[PDB]
Design a protein around this ligand. Sequence first.
Ligand SMILES: NC(=O)C1=CN([C@@H]2O[C@H](COP(=O)(O)OP(=O)(O)OC[C@H]3O[C@@H](n4cnc5c(N)ncnc54)[C@H](OP(=O)(O)O)[C@@H]3O)[C@@H](O)[C@H]2O)C=CC1
Ligand SMILES: [Zn+2]
Lengths: 460, 208, 125, 297, 96, 115, 86
Amino acid sequence: SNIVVSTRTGEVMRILPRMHEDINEEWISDKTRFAYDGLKRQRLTQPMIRNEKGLLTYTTWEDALSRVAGMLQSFQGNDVAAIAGGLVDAEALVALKDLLNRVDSDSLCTEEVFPTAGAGTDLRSNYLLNTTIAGVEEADVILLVGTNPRFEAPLFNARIRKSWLHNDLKVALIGSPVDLTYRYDHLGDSPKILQDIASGNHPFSQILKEAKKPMVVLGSSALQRSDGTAILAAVSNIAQNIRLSSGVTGDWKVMNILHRIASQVAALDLGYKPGVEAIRKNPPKVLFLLGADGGCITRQDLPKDCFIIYQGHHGDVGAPMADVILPGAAYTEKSATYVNTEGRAQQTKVAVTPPGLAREDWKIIRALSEIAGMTLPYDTLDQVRSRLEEVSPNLVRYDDVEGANYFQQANELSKLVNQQLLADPLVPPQLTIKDFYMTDSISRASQTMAKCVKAVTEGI
Amino acid sequence: TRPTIRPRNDVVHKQLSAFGQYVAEILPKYVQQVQVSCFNELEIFIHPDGVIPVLTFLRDHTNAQFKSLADLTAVDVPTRQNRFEIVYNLLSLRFNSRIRVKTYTDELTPIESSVTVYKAANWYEREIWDMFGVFFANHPDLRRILTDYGFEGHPFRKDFPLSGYVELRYDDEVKRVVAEPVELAQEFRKFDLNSPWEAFPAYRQPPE
Amino acid sequence: QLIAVDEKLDITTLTGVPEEHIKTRKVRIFVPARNNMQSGVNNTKKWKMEFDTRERWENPLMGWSSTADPLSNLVLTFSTKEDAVAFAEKNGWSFDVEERKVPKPKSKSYGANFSWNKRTRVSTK
Amino acid sequence: LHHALIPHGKGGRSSVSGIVATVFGATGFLGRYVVNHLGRMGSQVIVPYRCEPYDTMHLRPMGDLGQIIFMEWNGKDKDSIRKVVEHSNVVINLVGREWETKNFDFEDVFVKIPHAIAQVSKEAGVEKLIHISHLNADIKSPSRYLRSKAVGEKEVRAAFPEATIIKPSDIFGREDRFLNYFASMRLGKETVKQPVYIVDVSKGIINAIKDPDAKGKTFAFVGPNRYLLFDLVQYIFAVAYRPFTTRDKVERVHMSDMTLPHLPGLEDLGIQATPLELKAIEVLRRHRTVKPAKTVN
Amino acid sequence: GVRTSPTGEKVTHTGQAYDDGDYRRVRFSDRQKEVNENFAIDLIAEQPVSEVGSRVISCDGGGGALGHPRVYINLDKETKTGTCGYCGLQFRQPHH
Amino acid sequence: GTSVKPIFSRDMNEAKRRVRELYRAWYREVPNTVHLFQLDISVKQGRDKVREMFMKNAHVTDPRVVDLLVIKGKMELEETINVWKQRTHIMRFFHETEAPRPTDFLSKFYVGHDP
Amino acid sequence: LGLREIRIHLCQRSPGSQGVRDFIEKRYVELKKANPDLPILIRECSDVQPKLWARYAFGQEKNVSLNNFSADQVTRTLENVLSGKA
Ligand SMILES: NC(=O)C1=CN([C@@H]2O[C@H](COP(=O)(O)OP(=O)(O)OC[C@H]3O[C@@H](n4cnc5c(N)ncnc54)[C@H](OP(=O)(O)O)[C@@H]3O)[C@@H](O)[C@H]2O)C=CC1
Ligand SMILES: [Zn+2]
């Protein structure tokens, strides 16, 4: 959602909404509005390295960059690896891609899991919200599979509520009976109901049959539970049955995926491999944590004497387990490109400059490359964005949401594997309001979010 | 209109409108527009090539004889193709009246110098050249008049920064006053004072 | 009496701006978004050209906000987007243009509040 | 790095460079150049002055508001040194008098004061200390000045093991005591001199501050060209358009300039030493009312 | 109510005091630090709570035109006392 | 089309002629300027500075811009001839008090965020 | 020399991408059957010539234009790139 950052004397004061009729209309969520408080707390301001006692101590940029470049030169190939966090821009992502490509490494992993079987991330529409946020106003029935959009994407749920109020849109949910601020038809909890709808036994198959503009939305949280391949295959089968039986109403694009982190689509468009299983299959000897603070990979899942580099802006679960800490910029301190779940690429602007000795993330990666002799061709931001256009030309069209529909190829590619579903009901992580405030490093370091959690747990 | 409103003079408005007719009729080659404001100010908009001819006529005609040049200035409107607006203010002691003549120009088109018509304009034109960069042809001696020697840029243009680009101090190393890029201990605070809710409906523009 | 020469206008050598304040700055041309604290729209009529934010640091004495770029407070106003682009081009600044966002027309109906069978029926007023 | 000490700005008058420097003897010939180079780039300078406040007045415009802080001290007391270098991270020692007083001999000036300064700096946690000695400084030297420098240089290195020692070679400048000395006269052909420009020495001190690897190193700051005394004085008198300090100065000026090829020099800090032919006119234009001297290499 | 820092500096009513490693303390050597001794928060904490027998009470800060703009305060909440937004004086209805 | 009004020239050849005349005058003036203002630079340095100033505007391809720069340079020359400037004004052309701003990406990255 | 990925940039509405589009809509599926591990990224341009990128070991890349190529020509050039033959 578009925002306005209000500053004064180089300090962030508040976040206000900005009008985009197609994304958020006029509203922003409480996290978006009130989590800027964490940008002034738990911040990483200077480079740090491990001393003889094993503790982290401050050091200059030259020392840390040289110490990282030493290990980057010493090792090569699969021994080097990278993990992308939830608040990473496209420029840093492509910089890391090129830096590890100059070392012959493809182990670019993301904390969020997206099933790669079949089409994987080859076809863009396989991991986007093809109906778009505005298009929800034209649907007449929507199916939600293993999502709690009220907390995973509050403005998406607000748009659904508006369409429910004004267009008599009918909603059905497959998952835990969460509160979505409107009445919905709870089909059930067990994932096998999807197959039942695929079989045609459940009457909701007849319900989706008669709809002029149906809609199926699947969230990545239900793709995390190791049944992502099977659940995605079932949902794609439902979409294929709808399109095949009801006929092709046109360019309606029934199939939709709702994302939860900001950097997922930008990473997938740049060729990153979703998930972290590639790290698990081939543990590396040196690891880059480009803002990774999820705890998916610990030092137990890594060999001894592993070299870990953390590049980010808050000290969180990812920082104390590192050997070299490089301070980066936040989303309010850099002109950076992010792609939303619609697949629309939007760029931020520089509101303040990074505190202390922090620098722009892509500049950090480029300097590190130039130290280790693998000097990246680009020097300025325009050249970085030209590189981004070369890798993916849709990352430079800054308000487009339109794209090709290649649903048939991705659907027929998913029928090759026939992985089975677990007997485990779909339970989203965001079960209640108390789980919405604390989500990422900026939210966790926020005192206002802590007060909100305290008030929810006990009110006065 | 009770005592808090400025009184209105219809007679002077009519007289100035009639004289605008008169000047319009005599010089159709150059005059492009004539206006009389609500507070009885009469201004005539002309083509740049008519500056010498329009000015000479106002001064010498038995009905004009605007023998005094009160002021000459320029206005910078970056949104216009012809960026600079040259304004002449003339006073006639014979008929006890004031007139305004407006003209347009841009960065590279010179204006004819009216030092021949008014000796007063000389320094005035120099100031314009110093402050906006408008060149005046056939000026007896055109150079800077207010800025420092060697000052680069024209400060009164709208895209010139308020504090400029360089500042002066004393260096004991070279034992002289030196100029270095400007750094401010406290940066100028820019205020957004404009409010929504337009104040004067009579100036509302069409919504195109 | 007329040159009739053909070339794009470029006055960078006459304005006196330093070299690095032309080829390093990135201007933004945009219609400012309406303040969400107020419902008036009189501030979203013209086009504004502004520059890219540079570093602001703390003064060791008095803790004020110090800056080193002269163009930190320069905002220019234009009637049309084409005028702004022309100004930026002739002044040699690389620019980013954003298209004007207009609130779409909406269908408001007071009677819809008291609906017989739709969900638009309001609980209280 | 203690956030308040993080550099900020574009290296200007009002910027921050993260240097808290205490310049002992800042009211001398070299001190003014050092303080000017420090303050023109945003660093804070603490200056301790024995003399009247009026004498220091020239330094005031060398730094922005609050960036130059004057405090009184004396070498005989250690508490004053402690309070002057208490918060500094760089301590520069420029104290030195070329003659003898009834209260301060060469031993007081060049041995006891630098040793106490180094001891207090080490106690207070000062990160960097820069000391100034002479190029011709050795214990065996006949002159007391040079002999004193050797004892002091050794005792400072003992007190501050990672201190940086700078040994300038006969500094010349606008307020110097070399070209002014020879131009105010209005014995040679065996003494060779190696003068160094004052701005080069000041920039060398600044770079040694900014250079991390110059912790325990020792430097010899020398000019580009070696000149015989006789033809150098001939050039000095020619520039001034002229027809051609008790006992220690004469014995030191007739002493030839040593050569220490092992010690690193100005070029190792990135300074192209300026030939005396360029700056001789600048210094000596005021003594008036072209054919440079031959150099030996 | 002026306090003292562990290093020895006085603590202002805004709570400001340089930490141990801060070089800026050098500015106070051989000089003094300008600190107001009368803390407004303590001084206003010493004022009595007035007792007025009305639901709404008006405050102008005293002095008429020499005070602050007049404001009206509701005293219906018995759990607390109504505090003037400008003057800081506290009012209360006569409970029990 | 794109008809525009001349200032002094009709094409670029006359503009080049005026530029050459101005360079002639400046080259003639440099020695007298160095001697009269008591500069500490060499006449070689002054003439190299004049060459650098003339080279800064080498890419101009518009006669109006070119002869406007010629008028400005003539104004500056008249300032220097009549000794309206001082040593400080003349000395500024040399930026002897400004620290060398580095150009490589690594150096800029270390000092700050300014590209 | 080892191929690590390919990227096919095609325009959704430009005529020069026409045959390229047909390629996918005819036979991209078949391609993915033959290469179960090579990432074939498909991306969309606008007012730019279609192009195919090939990325090798150590980050080397080669790009070739596919303007007005038919499905046959794109299939042939893709075969040559996959096999390594020039
Ligand atoms: N010939 C040269 O220029 C070069 C000098 N040497 C060394 O360079 C150092 C300084 O250079 P320079 O500028 O020429 O010396 P100056 O004579 O110009 O200034 C001496 C400085 O030291 C201070 N000072 C001197 N004696 C005392 C004292 N007894 N107590 C407190 N402060 C004192 C002076 O303060 P105040 O004025 O108040 O007395 C003044 O700040 C000297 O220590 C010298 O040994 C290095 C090679 C040659
Ligand atoms: Zn009150």
